[PDB]
Amino acid sequence: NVPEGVIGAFKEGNSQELNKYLGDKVDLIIQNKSTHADKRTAEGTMAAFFSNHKVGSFNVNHQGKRDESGFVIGILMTANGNFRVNCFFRKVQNKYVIHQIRIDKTDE
């Protein structure tokens, strides 16, 4: 169910759903703050992000995958800013999991 499940999790601002797709180690870069997080910390960071930025919409404009990696790029509109989101996936145990999330506020 990748990347549909991740896209849905962002659309709903739901870190618990996102969790299901997180790798055991995730690099987060959120407003230029970088963290190399275990899964539990990554979910916690995303929970805080969604709590502080109530999601209105998430729309993807480019996605793709090869045998061992993939990506999703889109725009997240929230009640506290709009953000470009990049999710980069790696294949682990035959499943695509998130290895990096970048979130960067738009210039508006």
Interaction site with Cl ion (CB under 5 A): 37-38, 41, 48-49, 52, 59-60
Shortest separation between residue 36's beta carbon and Cl ion, angstroms: 7
Q: Are 84 and 73 in contact (CB under 8 A)?
A: yes
CB of 37 to Cl ion, least distance (A): 5
Backbone φ and ψ of 51, nearest 5°: -65, -40
Angle CA 46–25–30, to nearest 5 = 35
For residue 97, the minimal CB distance to Cl ion (Å) is: 17
Residue 75 or 88: the one with the smaller Cβ distance to Cl ion is 75
